Design a protein around this ligand. Structure first.
Ligand SMILES: [Mg+2]
Ligand SMILES: [Mg+2]
Ligand SMILES: [Mg+2]
Ligand SMILES: [Mg+2]
Ligand SMILES: [Mg+2]
Ligand SMILES: [Mg+2]
Ligand SMILES: [Mg+2]
Ligand SMILES: [Mg+2]
Ligand SMILES: [Mg+2]
Ligand SMILES: [Mg+2]
Ligand SMILES: [Mg+2]
Ligand SMILES: [Mg+2]
Lengths: 374, 325, 98, 120
RNA sequence: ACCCCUAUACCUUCUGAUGAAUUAACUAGAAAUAACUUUGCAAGGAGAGCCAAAGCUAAGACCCCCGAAACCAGACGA
RNA sequence: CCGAGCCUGGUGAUAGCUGGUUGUCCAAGAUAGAAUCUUAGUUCAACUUUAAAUUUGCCCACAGAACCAAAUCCCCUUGUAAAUUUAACUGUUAGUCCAAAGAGGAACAGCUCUUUGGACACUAGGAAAAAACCUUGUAGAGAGAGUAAAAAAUUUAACA
RNA sequence: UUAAUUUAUUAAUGCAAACACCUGCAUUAAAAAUUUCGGUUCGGAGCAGAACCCAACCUCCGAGCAGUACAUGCUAAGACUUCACCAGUCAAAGCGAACCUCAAUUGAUCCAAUAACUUGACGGAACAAGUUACCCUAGGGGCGCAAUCCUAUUCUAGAGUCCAUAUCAACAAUAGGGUUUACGACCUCUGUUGGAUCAGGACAUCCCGAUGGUGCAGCCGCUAUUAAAGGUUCGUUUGUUCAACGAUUAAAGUCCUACGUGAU
RNA sequence: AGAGUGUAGCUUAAAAGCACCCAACUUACACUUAGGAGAUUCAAUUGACGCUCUGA
C-alpha cells in the first residue's frame, strides 16, 4: 500500500487527509510510486486522475528529501520540475502541489504564457528558487533566453501529458528545454502512441515503461456507458438539445449535471456557445482564443462546478481531473481516437467509483471513426 | 533505469543534519587542497588517469637554524643572500639520490638502457668536457652538449676510491630500436683513476643524424666489488658498438651495483658529419620529422552548398589541364 | 541539443562533440569550445568521458563565491570529455644519405 | 509452455546396484558408443528433431555410432527419450588396414576381426 | 464367370455440400516497358531520329471466358 | 412481362460477385504485424524462392540481463551444413485441432479472444466405423524375414 | 422539397443596346437541372508598518515615451545546411586589443502593405434532407384434446425459534379452466407539468410545547437547542410548482416521493 | 598502591601538514598578502620522568 512507499509523516498525514478517496495506493499507483522512488527514468500510461500525479509526487518528495538545501541558493533554478501542455492543467497541478507542500518544505510554483511575467519573474518567484515548479514550455523558454531561469540545477523532471508534450508544436520547445542529463526523468500519460515513444528514444538510455489496464485498445471504461449516434448532424445539436432535455432530468434530481462539451474549433465553440446561451443554458466556454483572465475565471468556476454546461476547445481535451463530472457530451467527436478516449477519461476522474454519462455526436468525417467506434 | 555511483558518492558523509555546522571552505586554498586530496585518489567512477595514466643531526640542524636566526636578527630578513653553491653541495651530499632517481626516471634511462630497475645513484658524478683549456664544460644529469664541442673524450669526477665507466646512446641511432650505441668502455678502474682501468671500446664522438630530434646519451659508473674481464679495440664499426645495457647488467654484472649516472642530449652538428664522413666512412643520413597528412573528406557527385574548394581535394596541384592538345 | 558523437568513436579535429545550453558537458583533454558553450574535437582520436573535480578560473568571481559557499569537505566533480589522440604527432623518416 | 525442459543430473548419476544391474563399471569407460532410433521423429520438439538430424539419425531401426564425448553425451541426453544407445564394444583389437574389410557388428557389442565363412 | 478377402461414386468452395442422362462436335492468354538469356558489332551502336562513363541493335517471354439489372439517340406501336 | 412500352444502334456497357478455365517429366517450396467509407478486396510488412556477389552458421558454456514460475535473450566448445548484401515476380495472412498459460460467458457448449509446442488441411497400419488418439515417415518390383502401436478390468457387508 | 447548389429555360422587373420588336447583364421566383437520406493595456506611494502574494465602480501620482549609439577587429582549420542552389549559421589554430539612460513607457495571433528587410487594427481537415407496406438486379440466413401453463390439494417428508395442518412446501397422486403455445386441419378457398384524488417521509420548525442567552422591566421580538405527535387557508390575473391582488390565520415553512400519484 | 600511558592544540606523520596570533583591506567577520612563535620527556627493544582514571 502507501506505507510500502515509506511516506514521511507529512506525506502520511496528507494521504490520510486524502481519505476516503485514498485508503491504499492503486495497483497502477503501486506499480509507479516505488519504482519512481527507485529513481529510474520511466514513462507510465494509466487512467487519468488515478492518483498518478500523487504517485509521482510522493517519490519526488522522497527524492527531494535526499537533496541538500544548498542547491536552493538564490538566482538558481529548481531541482524538481513538472511540465504541462495547458495553462489550466499546469494551474491544477500547481494547486494540487500546494496542498501537499503546505505540510512540507517544498516551494510550489507555476509558469505559463499569457500571464504576468513580473509575478512570474518575481524576486520570490524566479530569483529565490523553489523546490517544485510546474512550467509551460513557452514561459520557460522565454526565461531561459532572457536568463531568468536555468537548466543545470534540475534533478527530478516530470512530464505530464507527455504524449501531448510530444506534439509537433510542443516537441521543439521541449527539446530546446532539453540541461543536466543525469536528472531522474518520469513521464506520465494515458496512452503512448508508438511514433512518439521512439522520439523519447532520441533522448533515452535504458528507461522503463509502466502500462495499466488492457494492453489492447482500452477504449471502453467498465464504469462508463457509451452510445453511438445513429442520426445526421442537422438535428443532432437539437438532439443534443433533446439530450439537454434529458439533461433537464439530470438537472431535476440533484445528481449533478456538470456537462463538458467537446468542440473542435474555438470559433465553432463560440457559435455553439452563443446558441446555447441563447437557448437559456448556463454555459461557459473555454478555448485557446479566450482571454487569459477570462479563461482563468472560467477554470476557477469549473473547479467550483459553477457552470453546469461548459464547452472546451482542443486546448482542454485531456488531463482534466474535475470533481462531479457526470455529463460529458462530445458535441464534436475528437479527431483522434486517443483524444476521444482522453476526453472520456477526463470525466469520472475520481476513479472507478464516481459514475458519469457519456454521449458523443456523430458527423460525416467521423464516419471512419465508426470503425474506431467498433 | 538509473545508474548511481559504484563506489561511495561524493559529498555524502559530510552533509549531516546540520549543514550550517560544517566548517566550509572559507579559504580557496582549503578547497583546492581538499580537491587535490580527492584527485590523488583513483576513485571508482574513473578519470583521466584511467585512460591516460638522526636525533643528533636534528639537534645540530636546529642549532644551525637558531644561529642563522640570531645572525639575521629579522634585520637580514628585512633579504638573505643564501649562496646556492653550499646549498647544492649539501643537497648532493644529503638528498641527491631521490632527485637523481627522479631525473633518471624522467629521462627514461633506466627504462630503456636497464629495461627498468631504477636506482638512486649514491656516488655524485659530474663530467667535464674538454673545450680548449679553460674552462671545461660541466655536464650534470641532463646537461646538453653539442657534437662539435664533444669531439674529444671528457673527464669525469665522482669523489670515490674498483669501478667501471661506460657511455651509451639510448636513442638507437642507425640500427634497429631498443638498443644503445656504445661510445666508451672503461673497466677495472683502480680508485678515482679511470685511466688505471683498461679501455675496451675507445671513445668515439657523437654522431646524431640531421633532423632526428634529440638523442639521449648517458655515462654510467657502477660499484664494482671485484675486477672482471671484458669481451673491442678502437673500431668505427656500428655492429660491435650496438649493445643493450640491460643484457650486460643482467648476466654479466652479477656482483655489481650502480653508483652514478650523468645524462646528456646530442644533436646533429658539423663534427657529427665529420665523424660520419671520415671516421664512419659512410654517408650521413638526415631525418624529416614529418607529420601525418589530412584524411580529406568524402567526394560526392555534387558540391551541394559548399564553396569551390570541394571539387579540388584529392589530387595535386597548381597547373593541370583539359582533354588533350 | 546534446552530445553529437558518443565516446570512443573516432572523429577528426573540429568535429562537433557535445552541444549544450548551460554547460552540462565540460571540457577534457583536446576538447575545443567557442562562444556557443559547445564541445568540439581538437584532435583526431578516441573520445572518453571522465568524472573529475572542476575548479573554476580566478576570473569567475561568482564561481569563486559559489565554491566558497561549498563546504570544505564538499567536492564538486564534473563530466569532462577527453580526446585521446590515436595517431602520433609525427615521425622522422630518413630523407637522404649525403 | 512446452520446451526443451530441465532434467536432473541424477538421471546420469549411476548406482553400484545399477552398475551391477547394468553391464558397466565405474572405471574404464567405453571408448565409443552406438545409437539407434526406436521412436518417431514426429511428435517431439522440432529442436529435438534437428538434434536427431545432427545425430545422423535420418534412418531408423538402423545402427549408427559416435565417440561418446561429454558433448556427445549431452547431445544424446537431449534426445535420449526417443533414442537408444549401446556400449559399442570391441573385445578384439581395432581394425587395422590389413584387416580393413572383414568387420561387422554383433548387437551384444561385438566388432568382428574377421567374419569368416566357416563355423567353429 | 460370380460366390473368396480388401475396397465411403468424381470435379471443386470449403476447415472438414452445387453441378454432370449419354454420346459427337465446337469453346476459353494475344499488351514486351524494365531486367535476363542467346546472336552480331564495339568507344560507338544501328539502313536520318534514340542512347551510350560498356554499351547499342535482333529475337524470346506478363496479361482470359461466361454471366447484371442501367442509361441516351433514333425509330415503331391506341 | 407495366412500377414504367418495344426494338436497333451506342454496347465486348458496367460491380472488387460466382463458376470454369484444356497433354507429360525433373528443382525448390503452408499462417507473423499495420493501414483501408475496410475485413467477399487492396496497399505498406515479413517470409520465401531463384540470379549474382561476399565466408561461418544451427546445437551452445561462463559471465551478464530491474526495481516497482516454466523461463527467455546475448552466449567459448561439440557434432553437423550452409550463412550476409543486391535484385525480379508471384504465393499465405479470414487457418483447424490437440497439451500448457490467461480474459470473457453457466467455471453449458463442434462458444469467443491473446502467448508456448506440435501435427494438420498430404502416405500406411491400428483403436469397430475414423480429417484430430498411437506407430510410422517419402518413392519401383519379389509369392522372404524381422519388428512397432496392438482386443479392458472387475463384487461385498459374519462375530464374541 | 423550405437538403444543398445553381438557372441552361421561361416570366417579370431594372439596366444596357435600337427608335412597340430583338440582344446582353443582374435579381427574383416558377419550373426544372446537378449532387446528398453513414456504420457497429502597463508602473511609483498607501490600504498591504519587518522573505512572497493580497482585495475594492480602493486612496493619489503616472505611461501609449523621450534623449543618446548603430576589438559589436582582421585572418584562419574543421562542422550544421532552410530538404537543389542561392541564402544562411557554429567554430578550433594565427595577427592585432581588453583582462545605453529611464520609473512605468506597453498586447497577442490572424488578415494587410512591403521584393525582402521592415511598416499597418500554447496547435487554425472543402462542401450535399426525408420515403418506397410497389421499387430493380446482385449477396447473407367455431369443433376434439390438454403434450405446456392449470387450481376446492391427499401422504405429510420438511421449513416455519417449538409446533407437518397461523403460513409455506417437494415427491408421487382424486382431478378436469377453454384465457396461452400447437397438435387434427372436422362449418370454408421505462407515456410527460400542474391540477382532481390519495397522500407517505425528513427537520433544515412557519406556528404551537419545553427551555438558554438577549441590546429579555412587561407586552412584542431575535438567537440557539429539543420536539414531526399535529397543521401550515380561501379565492382574483395567469393552464406555470413562482410572482402581483384582497380577506386571513397562532402559522399560511420547505422539499422528496419517475421535479409523487392519467395501464381514464 | 594499580591500570592506561607520551609528535606545539590535532594526526591508521616519519620532525611535516592542519591549527596560534599579529598587522593592512576590512563597520566588523572572512579571504589574501607579509610575517614569525611554535613539538616525537629523558637514560640504556627496556627503565624512570609527566598526566588521567581507580583507591586511601
Ligand atoms: Mg518504423
Ligand atoms: Mg494489435
Ligand atoms: Mg554534440
Ligand atoms: Mg479438369
Ligand atoms: Mg441436372
Ligand atoms: Mg445483360
Ligand atoms: Mg452489342
Ligand atoms: Mg465482361
Ligand atoms: Mg464485388
Ligand atoms: Mg482511414
Ligand atoms: Mg474517409
Ligand atoms: Mg469495403
Amino acid at each position: 500500500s502507501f506505507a510500502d512507499l515509506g511516506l514521511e509523516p507529512r506525506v502520511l498525514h496528507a494521504l490520510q487527509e486524502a481519505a476516503p478517496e485514498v485508503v491504499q495506493p492503486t495497483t497502477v499507483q503501486s506499480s509507479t510510486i516505488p519504482s519512481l522512488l527507485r529513481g529510474r527514468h520511466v514513462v507510465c500510461a494509466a487512467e487519468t486522475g488515478s492518483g498518478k500525479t500523487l504517485s509521482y509526487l510522493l517519490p519526488l518528495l522522497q527524492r527531494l528529501l535526499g537533496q541538500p538545501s544548498l542547491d536552493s541558493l538564490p538566482i538558481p533554478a529548481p531541482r524538481g520540475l513538472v511540465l504541462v501542455p495547458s495553462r489550466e492543467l499546469a494551474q491544477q497541478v500547481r494547486a494540487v502541489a500546494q496542498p501537499l507542500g503546505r505540510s512540507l518544505g517544498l516551494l510550489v510554483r507555476d509558469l505559463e504564457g499569457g500571464h504576468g511575467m513580473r509575478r512570474i519573474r518575481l524576486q520570490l518567484s524566479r530569483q529565490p528558487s523553489a523546490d517544485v515548479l510546474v512550467a509551460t514550455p513557452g514561459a520557460l523558454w522565454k526565461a531561459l533566453k532572457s536568463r531568468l531561469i536555468s537548466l543545470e540545477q534540475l534533478s527530478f523532471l516530470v512530464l505530464d501529458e507527455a504524449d501531448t508534450l510530444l506534439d509537433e508544436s510542443f516537441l521543439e520547445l521541449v527539446d530546446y528545454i532539453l540541461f543536466n542529463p543525469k536528472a531522474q526523468l518520469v513521464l506520465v500519460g494515458a496512452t503512448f502512441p508508438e511514433g512518439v515513444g521512439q522520439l523519447l528514444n532520441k533522448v533515452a538510455s535504458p528507461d522503463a515503461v509502466t502500462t495499466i489496464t488492457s494492453s489492447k485498445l482500452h477504449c471502453i471504461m467498465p464504469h462508463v456507458k457509451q452510445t453511438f449516434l445513429r442520426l445526421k448532424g442537422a438535428d443532432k445539436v437539437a438532439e443534443l438539445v433533446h439530450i439537454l432535455k434529458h439533461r433537464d432530468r439530470a438537472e431535476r434530481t440533484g445528481p449533478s449535471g456538470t456537462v463538458l462539451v467537446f468542440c473542435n474549433s474555438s470559433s465553432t465553440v463560440n457559435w455553439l456557445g452563443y446558441i446555447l446561451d441563447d437557448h437559456k443554458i448556463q454555459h461557459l466556454r473555454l478555448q485557446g482564443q479566450m482571454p487569459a483572465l477570462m479563461r482563468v475565471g472560467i477554470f476557477q468556476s469549473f473547479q467550483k462546478s459553477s457552470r453546469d454546461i461548459l464547452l472546451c476547445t482542443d486546448i482542454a481535451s485531456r488531463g482534466l481531473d474535475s470533481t462531479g463530472v457526470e455529463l460529458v457530451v462530445n458535441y464534436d467527436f475528437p479527431p483522434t481516437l486517443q483524444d476521444y478516449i482522453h476526453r472520456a477519461g477526463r470525466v469520472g476522474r475520481v476513479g472507478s467509483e464516481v459514475p458519469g454519462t457519456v454521449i458523443s455526436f456523430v458527423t460525416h468525417p467521423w464516419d471512419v471513426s465508426l470503425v474506431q467506434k467498433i | 533505469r538509473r545508474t548511481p555511483p559504484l563506489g561511495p558518492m561524493p559529498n555524502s558523509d559530510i552533509d549531516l543534519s546540520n549543514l550550517e555546522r560544517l566548517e566550509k571552505y572559507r579559504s580557496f586554498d582549503r578547497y583546492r587542497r581538499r580537491a587535490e586530496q580527492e584527485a590523488q585518489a583513483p576513485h571508482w567512477w574513473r578519470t583521466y588517469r584511467e585512460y591516460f595514466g638522526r636525533t643528533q643531526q636534528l639537534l645540530e640542524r636546529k642549532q644551525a637554524i637558531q644561529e642563522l636566526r640570531a645572525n639575521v636578527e629579522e634585520r637580514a630578513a628585512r633579504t638573505a643572500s643564501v649562496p646556492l653553491d653550499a646549498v647544492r653541495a649539501e643537497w648532493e651530499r644529503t638528498c641527491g639520490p631521490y632527485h637523481k632517481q627522479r631525473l633518471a626516471e624522467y629521462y627514461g634511462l633506466y627504462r630503456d638502457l636497464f629495461h627498468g630497475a631504477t636506482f638512486v645513484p649514491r656516488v655524485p658524478l659530474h663530467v667535464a668536457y674538454a673545450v680548449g683549456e679553460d674552462d671545461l664544460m660541466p655536464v650534470y644529469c641532463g646537461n646538453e652538449v653539442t657534437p662539435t664541442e664533444a669531439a674529444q673524450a671528457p673527464e669525469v669526477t665522482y669523489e670515490a676510491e674498483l669501478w667501471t665507466l661506460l657511455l651509451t646512446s639510448l636513442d638507437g641511432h642507425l640500427l634497429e630500436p631498443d638498443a644503445e650505441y656504445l661510445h666508451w668502455l672503461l673497466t677495472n678502474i683502480p680508485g678515482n683513476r679511470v685511466a688505471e682501468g683498461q679501455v675496451t671500446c675507445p671513445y668515439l664522438p657523437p654522431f646524431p643524424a640531421r633532423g632526428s630530434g634529440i638523442h639521449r646519451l648517458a655515462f654510467l659508473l657502477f660499484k664494482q666489488d671485484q675486477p672482471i674481464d671484458f669481451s673491442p679495440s678502437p673500431c668505427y664499426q656500428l655492429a660491435q658498438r650496438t649493445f643493450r645495457t640491460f643484457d650486460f647488467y643482467k648476466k654479466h654484472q652479477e656482483t655489481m651495483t650502480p653508483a652514478g649516472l650523468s645524462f646528456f642530449q646530442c644533436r646533429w652538428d658539423d663534427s657529427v658529419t665529420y665523424i660520419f664522413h671520415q671516421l664512419l666512412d659512410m654517408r650521413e643520413p638526415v631525418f624529416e620529422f614529418v607529420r601525418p597528412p589530412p584524411y580529406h573528406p568524402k567526394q560526392k557527385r555534387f558540391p551541394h552548398r559548399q564553396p569551390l574548394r570541394y571539387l579540388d581535394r584529392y589530387r595535386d596541384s597548381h597547373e593541370p589541364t583539359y582533354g588533350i592538345y | 541539443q546534446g552530445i553529437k558523437k558518443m565516446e570512443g568513436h573516432y572523429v577528426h579535429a573540429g568535429n562537433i562533440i557535445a552541444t549544450q545550453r548551460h554547460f552540462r558537458w565540460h571540457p577534457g583533454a583536446h576538447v575545443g569550445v567557442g562562444k556557443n558553450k559547445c564541445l568540439y574535437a581538437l584532435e583526431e582520436g578516441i573520445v572518453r568521458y571522465t568524472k573529475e573535480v572542476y575548479v573554476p578560473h580566478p576570473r569567475n568571481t561568482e564561481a569563486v563565491d559559489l565554491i566558497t559557499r561549498l563546504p570544505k569537505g564538499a567536492v564538486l566533480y564534473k563530466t569532462f570529455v577527453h580526446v585521446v589522440p590515436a595517431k602520433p604527432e609525427g615521425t622522422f623518416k630518413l630523407v637522404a644519405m649525403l | 509452455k512446452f520446451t526443451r525442459s530441465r532434467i536432473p543430473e541424477k538421471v546420469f548419476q549411476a548406482s553400484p546396484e545399477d552398475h551391477e544391474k547394468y553391464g558397466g563399471d565405474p572405471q574404464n569407460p567405453h571408448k565409443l558408443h552406438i545409437v539407434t532410433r526406436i521412436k518417431s521423429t514426429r511428435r517431439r520438439p522440432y529442436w529435438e528433431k534437428d538434434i536427431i538430424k545432427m545425430l545422423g539419425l535420418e534412418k531408423a531401426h538402423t545402427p549408427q555410432v559416435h565417440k561418446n564425448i561429454p558433448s556427445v553425451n549431452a547431445k544424446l541426453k537431449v534426445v535420449k527419450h526417443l533414442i537408444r544407445i549401446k556400449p559399442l564394444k570391441l573385445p578384439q583389437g581395432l581394425p587395422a588396414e590389413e584387416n580393413m574389410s572383414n568387420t561387422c557388428l554383433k548387437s551384444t557389442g561385438e566388432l568382428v576381426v574377421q567374419w569368416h565363412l566357416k563355423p567353429v
